[PDB]
Symmetry: D3
């Protein structure tokens, strides 16, 4: 499968790097999309190369979506093209994985009312106001939506997600 990541500077480093490698283990192709080509740098100083910009993404060409956390989702969610990608892929029923602040992008896409999931506890009230049935669990599977809360949850986050790509 082709797996797309939406992110930017100040991503939470391990929430990007862990799924990136865990999905390559399975043989999937992984793509990093951001505002500009070049490199982006995490909160803790790991740098990754950007594969394409939001403007060049055709959502039809990707099979699954990963939304890491950090401070990056508060900037990505103000980009109409990035929010449009997540709206389309989530509403088409493609697998979507989010963790920590990552679902702020789905809040802004307007796709979450009635869905069941989790997030960083610091934004649970915002999830609830977007209509989420919010659950305090290390991983929640709701149809195509796999969500987790914090870096401690990584093992469970990707355990469930990889099942949906098989």
């Amino acid at each position: 499968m082709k797996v797309l990541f939406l992110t930017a500077n100040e991503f939470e480093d391990v929430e990007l790097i862990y799924p990136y490698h865990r999905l390559k283990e399975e043989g999937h192709a992984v793509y990093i999309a951001s505002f500009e080509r070049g490199t982006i740098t995490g909160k803790h100083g790991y740098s990754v190369k950007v594969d394409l910009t939001f403007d060049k993404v055709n959502p039809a060409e990707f099979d699954a979506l990963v939304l890491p956390g950090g401070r990056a989702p508060e900037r990505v969610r103000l980009n109409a093209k990035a929010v449009s990608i997540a709206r389309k892929m989530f509403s088409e029923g493609k697998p979507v994985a989010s963790i920590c602040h990552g679902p702020q992008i789905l809040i802004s896409a307007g796709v979450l009312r009635g869905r069941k999931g989790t997030s960083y506890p610091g934004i649970k009230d915002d999830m609830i106001n977007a209509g989420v049935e919010w659950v305090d669990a290390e991983v929640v599977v709701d149809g195509n939506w796999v969500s987790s809360r914090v870096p401690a949850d990584l093992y469970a986050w990707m355990r469930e997600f990889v099942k949906l790509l098989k």
Copy 2:
């Protein structure tokens, strides 16, 4: 007047320090409340002393409330006592000043339905979902609630808040 600040580590430094001194200039008493007595440190490394904890605050004893930004509001808003302080003071009509991520504490208080205000743009969708009529202005006055967006609005933010304390 006795002006109370609700904050914690990783406050945005100038959004705490600027209103602290601007209000001291007017002769008001300023108190920093947080989780624990001691010092708290800002995103940029400035330190300040905590006057009292959230448990020891009696909202009746204070006349106004200031909610600086940074990352601290996402922690504060998870503390039931801190949120109750903000609920009582805001709903009793006492003047409340908020900037950048500050109003996340008011979202969790449940007091923003049908009110008008602003915030850091990265959380404008969460403000709208809480019931806020969201405005892109350097300062917004809506009764007792004075709201601003970013550090560049500091001059206008306190210009309007100072008037409500006369």
Copy 3:
């Protein structure tokens, strides 16, 4: 009024940002002058844009002068044009505000003989040797010269300087 700031990289961040906004509140125009156009960054990482260089400043065009601290005054004071600006404005009776290491620029201007003021305590011996009657107070007003010591004096520093601009 047109208020001029003389500064450079490694300014003490709140000693620039606090008077910048406090004076904007009053409706004054504030200009940052430095060695080169662009941005300058403070000790704690805040950045601000340079409005004009020292070479393009005509002291006749400005009404007041602010000299923040940090490590920048030790560089500024070596620039003959920056020192000449401070000499002319201070000796023409225009209001001048200085804090922490700020008055090092006035020492090099040669205009402090027999004047009364304060500074960061770590340079009080250099103030005395320049001819200053040195006072340990949160703010000192001596004609046109308003002087303070450390960031904890900000509220009193601008309280007194604002009066001279009315």
Copy 4:
């Protein structure tokens, strides 16, 4: 299985965190051993809790061994007990994964003569002088010994190691 990590301060953060979670996903128990109980911190600032000290480790009680990289291996390899843990588990045929600087501990254990593997290229000449047949590949499997070079190899590293624990 019970999986043991030998490490210390200044480990390469993702070379510890990634196998940690990848092996919890399979249901294995994971134990971090270092010099002292408490927490250790990686080169990039992530912190993990130490489960037991080197002195308390009985190699017989553990089924597999992971040696992450960073600078920590140059300090671990000076601790005679830690080197004997590695020596015992490796020579008993138990699965051992090493990456980047990790195999420096195995050099010091004296168990690599005639074996085949890789490492951070910066220490390849030291691997060769310890008797290793050194290969430039993203992962090498030599019996019980799974070796990789750098953080970009993580996906392949644990892909092969996980097979040996089934």
Copy 5:
């Protein structure tokens, strides 16, 4: 000889470490005095152990004095016991080496009027107001006083100083 250093946190690292080792090469005993026992840390993060506090120094027991730069001299020069040590040793004619901001301590001792020397150029006007004949040179020898300006001067600074201890 017994060589005494007066310093504190935020010394310029190489201006302390270079003379420390250069003087041990010759067989002299070197002692670090500061406010408190324990360790002090330079601007660039090197740490050194403090041998004794200002309170325990008997100036008669030391043969020569070294004053490194950094931000530390602005704190040391406010300590009456530290300034007293430098006053006594310099006025008794013992060898004294200073660099960069180091002579701020001698300014405060009141021993420099009529002497010839150099400093960091940023404080040359303060040297002049203390009565120094100020010279722009990599090293100046004036009787017992060897002075230099910046880290680039280290080689010449200690070349001349070691001659005075022979």
Copy 6:
């Protein structure tokens, strides 16, 4: 004499700066060689200018060689030209000083079999496997080869090296 340094980014700052100045004191010329012209930066933030790149170095034109430590030796030792510079000067009997990780370049040059010396203890087993008789001492002199372990050894390191250039 003309003295050559082989190094790169992330050198141990004082292991380069101290021999640099100590050898200028004697009147020797000193040249920094690295991968690219411009500046390189040490682990602690000090910057030095690169005089020439490895490709332009003719070993015949230089009389002595210094190998500082840090992480830079693990990158320099992968550059075939830099290793051949070290190999040529060392085997021609020219004076060579190494400290901490520095001798990793000499391991890769193949010139240490049967020689006597020291290093950072963290790589002593690698020195032993390269054929060195490894000694725990602050300085070792083996013909043209002066070796030390750590920054605390600087005084002794250059004390012995300076003798070989007279």
